[PDB]
Amino acid sequence: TPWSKSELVRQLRDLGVRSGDMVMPHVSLRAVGPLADGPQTLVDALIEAVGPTGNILAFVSWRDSPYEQTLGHDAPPAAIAQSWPAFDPDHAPAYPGFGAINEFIRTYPGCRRSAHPDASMAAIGPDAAWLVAPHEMGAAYGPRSPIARFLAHAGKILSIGAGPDAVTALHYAEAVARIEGKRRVTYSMPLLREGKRVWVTTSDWDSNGILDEYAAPDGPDAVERIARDYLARTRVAQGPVGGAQSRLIDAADIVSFGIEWLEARHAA
Ligand SMILES: NC[C@H]1O[C@H](O[C@H]2[C@H](O)[C@@H](O[C@H]3O[C@H](CO)[C@@H](O)[C@H](N)[C@H]3O)[C@H](N)C[C@@H]2N)[C@H](O)[C@@H](O)[C@@H]1O
Ligand SMILES: [Mg+2]
């Protein structure tokens, strides 16, 4: 029998979600199982669990980000440059590969959306505007990004059937780690600026692996290895949400652990 909102809310409370919390979810809907009214049921449950003073932050990205098409070029290739749609935060769909729940989150009434087309973040709650801006090219997941503010805002990472590789916030640890050999990428995104499409080319840390040994396409990347180690070494509330094994992680703690983990393994 499909899970009801009420059942999910009680499960979230059992896991340690409290009214007022700042939560970043990572969800496998297949692990959760059928929901009374589909994925919206879990969105509604998350919003009810954090309450009217709580906040939700999600990494939603963009279905049509021209990342691969512009990667490694000093400018968007001509055919891309001419016809790609500008990123419109009000209308651009979420990237399906990071979770089907994210399109439900970003279309929720009052949801705010960050301006970085590839790293785009969606937030619901009284602090949503403060969370989502600024979000500039060159600051995808590190200092000055929504993740940086989430980490200063008592953020909790709510992993609902998701693996250790899913913990986006650990890209912050990669950005700030004082280690040699860090990989960077260059790409171009089409932004809206006063109603006009403007191509912006930037470099940033490689979010597919901060060092060569973490950058195999299949992984494991550093995020995965850090989070696996962390979860083997830390008390973290665990329990079901729907049918999914779930965990509620203190974001500042896991990111601090990850900075230390990288700096202990790689020379400065
Ligand atoms: N490296 C191993 C990891 O790879 C993916 O996760 C990474 C995405 O690939 C990145 O996405 C970027 O690169 C994609 C592929 O080029 C583009 O499509 C996309 N627009 C870009 O934002 C994202 N920023 C960080 C995320 N950790 C898998 O999901 C994850 O399970 C696995 O551990
Ligand atoms: Mg508040």
Q: Is the CB of 65 under 6 A from ligand 1?
A: yes
Q: Cα(62)–Cα(246) distance, rounded to whole angstroms?
A: 26
What is the number of the ligand 1 atom nearest to the C-alpha of 209?
1
- How many CB atoms are closer than 10 A to CB 91? 9
Of 118, 85, 116, 120, which Cα lies nearest the Cα of 105? 120
Helices (H), 84-221: 101-106, 128-132, 146-152, 170-176
- Domain definitions of the chain by residue range: 1-268
Q: Is the CB of 70 under 6 A from ligand 1?
A: no
* Residues 119-151 as b or e (16 or more Cβ within 10 Å = b): bbbbbbbebbeebbbebebebbbbeebbbbbbb
Q: Is the CB of 67 under 6 A from ligand 1?
A: yes
How far does Cα 131 stand from its chain's mean position? 13
Q: Judging by DSSP bridges, how do beta strands 36-38 and 112-113 pair with one another?
A: unpaired
Q: Cα(107)–Cα(260) distance, rounded to whole angstroms?
A: 37
Ligand 1: centre distance to CA 97 (Å)? 9
| DSSP conformation class of 190 | E
Q: How was this structure determined?
A: X-ray
Ligand 1: centre distance to CA 36 (Å)? 31
Ligand 1: centre distance to CA 13 (Å)? 31
| Annotated binding-site members for CoA | 26-30, 100, 171
Q: Cα(205)–Cα(64) distance, rounded to whole angstroms?
A: 21
Helices (H), 114-180: 128-132, 146-152, 170-176
